[PDB]
Structure formats: C-alpha cells, structure tokens
Amino acid sequence: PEELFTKLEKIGEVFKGIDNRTQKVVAIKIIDLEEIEDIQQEITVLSQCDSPYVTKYYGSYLKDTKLWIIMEYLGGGSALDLLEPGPLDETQIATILREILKGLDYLHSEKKIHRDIKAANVLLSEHGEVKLADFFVGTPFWMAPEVIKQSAYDSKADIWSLGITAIELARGEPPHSELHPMKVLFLIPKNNPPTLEGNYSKPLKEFVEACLNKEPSFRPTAKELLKHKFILRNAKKTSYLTELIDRYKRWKAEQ
Ligand SMILES: [Hg+2]
Ligand SMILES: [Hg+2]
Known part of the structure; x- marks a missing residue:
C-alpha cells in the first residue's frame, strides 16, 4: 500500500x-x-x-x-522551539523575519493569505532554512483587529500578525500572553496597538510599529518590509541560524 x-x-x-x-x-x-x-x-x-x-x-x-x-x-524545530533556551539577538530576529517576509511575499503575490503567522508556524531545516507552515480564523494573540471583528480583510492581516511575531521573536511571547484568550479578543480591537518595549534598536521598534497599524492600508506590504532598515542592517546568512538550532538541541538534552 x-x-x-x-x-x-x-x-x-x-x-x-x-x-x-x-x-x-x-x-x-x-x-x-x-x-x-x-x-x-x-x-x-x-x-x-x-x-x-x-x-x-x-x-x-x-x-x-x-x-x-x-x-x-524540517528538523531544525520551529522558531518557537528556538526561543525556549533564551533570547534571540537582533541578527537572528532580522534573518528569521526576512525569510518569513519572502514567504509572505510569495503567498501574497499568489493571492493567498496565511492567516496564522506566529513563531510556532515558522519551521527551520537542520541547515537553518526558514519556511512557513500550517495553512474568523487564526490564533487570537496574533490576529489582526479586522480579523477579530469578522470585518473584511486581505493579506494586510498577515502583516499585523508579522508584527506580533516580531514582538514574540524579540520578547519570547506575544502581547497579552498572560490573559485569557477571550479577554484578548476584546482588547485587540479596543486598545491602542502593541509596541515593542525594552532595550531594542530603533529600527526594530519601528519595524514593529509599522506592522502594527490598526488601519490595514497603512501597513506596508511584505515586499516593502524586505527593504526596511531593520531587515537591511541586521539580516545575515540563514546558515548562521545553525547556532540557534544547536543551542536548542543542547538545551533540550539537559531537560
Ligand atoms: Hg500557494
Ligand atoms: Hg500554501
């Protein structure tokens, strides 16, 4: 068979x-x-x-x-797995973001919308190649306000999710991570959009702010973000991500 x-x-x-x-x-x-x-x-x-x-x-x-x-x-684990041992640096953040953007640019050019962008759905090969996985829909913490409101939306909803994923990659978790998902469902449409807080470079905070605009037409497209200052200053070879893969394997072995 x-x-x-x-x-x-x-x-x-x-x-x-x-x-x-x-x-x-x-x-x-x-x-x-x-x-x-x-x-x-x-x-x-x-x-x-x-x-x-x-x-x-x-x-x-x-x-x-x-x-x-x-x-x-893909045997490198998810981006979420790789956050488990500790924080990423900005090179690693930018490199991962850049690859996700290439994936989003591909999908958005093919009239597709991922609708569930989050670190758990970003998978790495053993060599550090980054690919998108896993097909009102999404995961509440990462959902765009227009998606939650069951309003009309397009590929710009993925851009909001990318910004929340940038916060997750920098801080280890999305905004509101300690709150009941049902509470988060009203907070997102109601509240000012999240910002990246803490000691991060200006371009990184600016990248996040650009994605997280409550008005979808003001969010840049994936093509535009590939040329963002943060991506350009910080993104390096995907092969450098092997270091993160190794960190996780060592961490996972020690329990
Ligand atoms: Hg496709
Ligand atoms: Hg697809």
Missing part, C-alpha cells in the same frame, strides 16, 4: 519517514478519517503552493481509513 515510505519515530499523528525511492526524509501526517472538510481544504492549498519558503507537499494517500499526507521534513 503505502510502502513507498518507511515510517520512523513519531515527531493526527506526525512521523519522520523515508522515501524508499530516493532515501530522502519526509514528514508523514496520518489522520484517521473515521470534520474532513477542513483537512480537505488544507491539502488543496498546499498542493497549490510551490515555494522554497513554504513547506512542500509531496502527496496524499489513503490506506484503509487512514490518510497519509507526505510533507517536507
């Missing part, structure tokens, strides 16, 4: 697997089909995406009642 792949360790259950034809590692999500419409939608979008900044989809298979979804394997 699906002996085109060898299931390795569990990493909806996700497994590391190996493509028997090439010996390349894949991620295998196995869903017991026994609502299916949401799974259905996710698969169609992934197969419609084709970018090095977006997790590759390799195909779906049915075995008995189980759907096998073959995905790009």
Whole structure:
C-alpha cells in the first residue's frame, strides 16, 4: 500500500519517514478519517503552493481509513522551539523575519493569505532554512483587529500578525500572553496597538510599529518590509541560524 515510505519515530499523528525511492526524509501526517472538510481544504492549498519558503507537499494517500499526507521534513524545530533556551539577538530576529517576509511575499503575490503567522508556524531545516507552515480564523494573540471583528480583510492581516511575531521573536511571547484568550479578543480591537518595549534598536521598534497599524492600508506590504532598515542592517546568512538550532538541541538534552 503505502510502502513507498518507511515510517520512523513519531515527531493526527506526525512521523519522520523515508522515501524508499530516493532515501530522502519526509514528514508523514496520518489522520484517521473515521470534520474532513477542513483537512480537505488544507491539502488543496498546499498542493497549490510551490515555494522554497513554504513547506512542500509531496502527496496524499489513503490506506484503509487512514490518510497519509507526505510533507517536507524540517528538523531544525520551529522558531518557537528556538526561543525556549533564551533570547534571540537582533541578527537572528532580522534573518528569521526576512525569510518569513519572502514567504509572505510569495503567498501574497499568489493571492493567498496565511492567516496564522506566529513563531510556532515558522519551521527551520537542520541547515537553518526558514519556511512557513500550517495553512474568523487564526490564533487570537496574533490576529489582526479586522480579523477579530469578522470585518473584511486581505493579506494586510498577515502583516499585523508579522508584527506580533516580531514582538514574540524579540520578547519570547506575544502581547497579552498572560490573559485569557477571550479577554484578548476584546482588547485587540479596543486598545491602542502593541509596541515593542525594552532595550531594542530603533529600527526594530519601528519595524514593529509599522506592522502594527490598526488601519490595514497603512501597513506596508511584505515586499516593502524586505527593504526596511531593520531587515537591511541586521539580516545575515540563514546558515548562521545553525547556532540557534544547536543551542536548542543542547538545551533540550539537559531537560
Ligand atoms: Hg500554501
Ligand atoms: Hg500557494
């Protein structure tokens, strides 16, 4: 059946697997089909995406009642995983942001909206390549005020989410992280937008402020932000991110 792949360790259950034809590692999500419409939608979008900044989809298979979804394997962890040992520096922040922006620029140029940009959905390869993962929708802390209000929105909603993600990358968590999500649901539309507080460079605070404009048309586009002062002064080779990957592995081993 699906002996085109060898299931390795569990990493909806996700497994590391190996493509028997090439010996390349894949991620295998196995869903017991026994609502299916949401799974259905996710698969169609992934197969419609084709970018090095977006997790590759390799195909779906049915075995008995189980759907096998073959995905790009990325063994560096999520950006959220990499915050666990301690703070990032601004080079690491800018580098990660820059790659997310390339992914957003790709998606926004293809008339797509991610709708769930957050550090947990930014995945790294073992070599430090950064890609976007995981397809009123979103995760409340990162949701744009127009999304929460169930108002009309477009790709600018992702830009707001990018700003909240920039705060998460700098501070380790989004604004309001200690509050019940239902309270956050009224706070976001009501309150002044968050700002990055603490000892960060002016360009970084300015990058965040630009994303977090309550008026979506005043937020820059992903193309524009790729040329932001903070990105240009601070972003370096993605291969330098291996240091963060190593930091996490060491941290995770010590418990
Ligand atoms: Hg996609
Ligand atoms: Hg796409």
